[PDB]
Amino acid sequence: MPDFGDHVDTSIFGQILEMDEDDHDFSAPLVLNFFEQAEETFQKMETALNNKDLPELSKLGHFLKGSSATLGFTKIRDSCQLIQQYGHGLNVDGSSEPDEGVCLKKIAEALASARVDTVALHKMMREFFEY
């Protein structure tokens, strides 16, 4: 009975859980790798924000969307989707956004969300894998 609320897609992550032979031999190493990797990615997003590098932010966004999607971590993936789009000058209505200043700001907002939601999910997983 694991409730991750809006953070986890039960179908996608559930499939992962069913691959365990009840010590989480497969799922937990994978969750750990996701989080270690996630934080390396955020550091780079931080650096890219400092240097105001929209193209790099987009790539970083695209990458973390893909790894989070594979685990069914949908709240993180949606934040990463935002970073991908705004990096390419596309708003959430899908319109062009020429003003780089606004894109940067939006990405910052989205990155703060992704980071916070990653923390919250990491806590819930630690609890799950310690039972």
Residue numbers in the entry: 43 to 63, 65 to 174
Which statements did the authors publish about this structure?
If the HK incorporates a REC domain (REC-1) is denoted as hybrid histidine kinase (hHK), and the first His-Asp phosphotransfer event occurs in the same polypeptide chain. Then, HPt protein containing a phosphorylatable His shuffles the phosphoryl group from the phosphorylatable Asp in the REC-1 domain to the phosphorylatable Asp in the REC domain of an RR (REC-2) in two more phosphotransfer steps. In fungi, the HPt accepts the phosphoryl group from REC-1 domains of various hHKs upstream of the signaling pathway and forwards it downstream to REC-2 domains present in at least two conserved RRs, Ssk1 and Skn7. Also, we have obtained the crystal structures of Ct_HPt alone and in complex with REChHK6 bound to the phosphomimetic BeF3−, as well as the crystal structures of REChHK3 and RECCa_Sln1.
To analyze differences in the structure of Ct_HPt before and after binding to REChHK6, we obtained the crystal structure of isolated Ct_HPt. It contained four molecules in the AU and each molecule contributed to an interface area of ~800 Å2 between two molecules. The interface area contained several salt bridges between two Arg residues located in αE (R158 and R169) and two Glu residues located in αB (E82 and E89). Interestingly, R158 formed intrachain salt bridges with E82 and E89, as well as an interchain salt bridge with E82, while R169 formed an interchain salt bridge with E89. According to the EPPIC and PISA servers this interface was the result of crystal packing and SEC-MALS analysis with Ct_HPt indicated a MW of 18.1 kDa (theoretical MW is 18.7 kDa) demonstrating the presence of the monomeric species in solution. Finally, the structural comparison between Ct_HPt isolated and bound to REChHK6 demonstrated high structural similarity between them (rmsd of ~0.9 Å for 129 residues), although slight structural changes were observed in the N-terminal region, αA, loop αA–αB and loop αD–αE. Meanwhile, the intrachain salt bridge nucleated by R158 in αE with E82 and E89 in αB is also present and has not been disturbed. This fact indicates that Ct_HPt shows little plasticity, a useful conserved feature to be recognized similarly by several REC-1 domains. Finally, our studies have uncovered two salt bridges in Ct_HPt between two Glu residues in αB and an Arg residue in αE that provide bundle stability. As these residues seem rather conserved between human fungal pathogens, except in S. cerevisiae, we envision that these salt bridges could be present in other HPt proteins. These salt bridges do not intervene in complex recognition but seem to provide bundle stability preventing conformational plasticity.
